[PDB]
Structure 1
């Protein structure tokens, strides 16, 4: 024969599907995609480095938007 046959769904198969539904509902877990919030985003040496890197990114990011002539995001 060629290829697969396609099964006839019987009552034991359909009620086993119903058991899968009842197990997921009662033991509630779902693959619903969840709403992300859109706008989601020594220690003196680490924070001094972090503030210097934020200064660098404000200067450089301003110069990049100026090169693109304000067609940024």
Structure 2
């Protein structure tokens, strides 16, 4: 049969390795979004 909504994704080792590798890339680049202080 058919379903009606997105199934909640189970966390596995592969996706958490991909995610920590993404964070590794972000930190190594030191390019990440922050709320920088307003000037003037």
Q: Higher relative CO (CA 8 A, sep ≥ 6), structure 1 or 2? A: 2
Structure with the bigger percentage of helix: 1
What are the ranges of 5 or more consecutive residues in structure 1 without an aligned counterpart?
41-73
Kindly tell me the number of residue pairs found equivalent between the two proteins: 38
Moved over 2 A (4+): none
Aligned Cα root-mean-square deviation (Å): 0.9
Give 1 or 2 for the bigger CA radius of gyration.
1
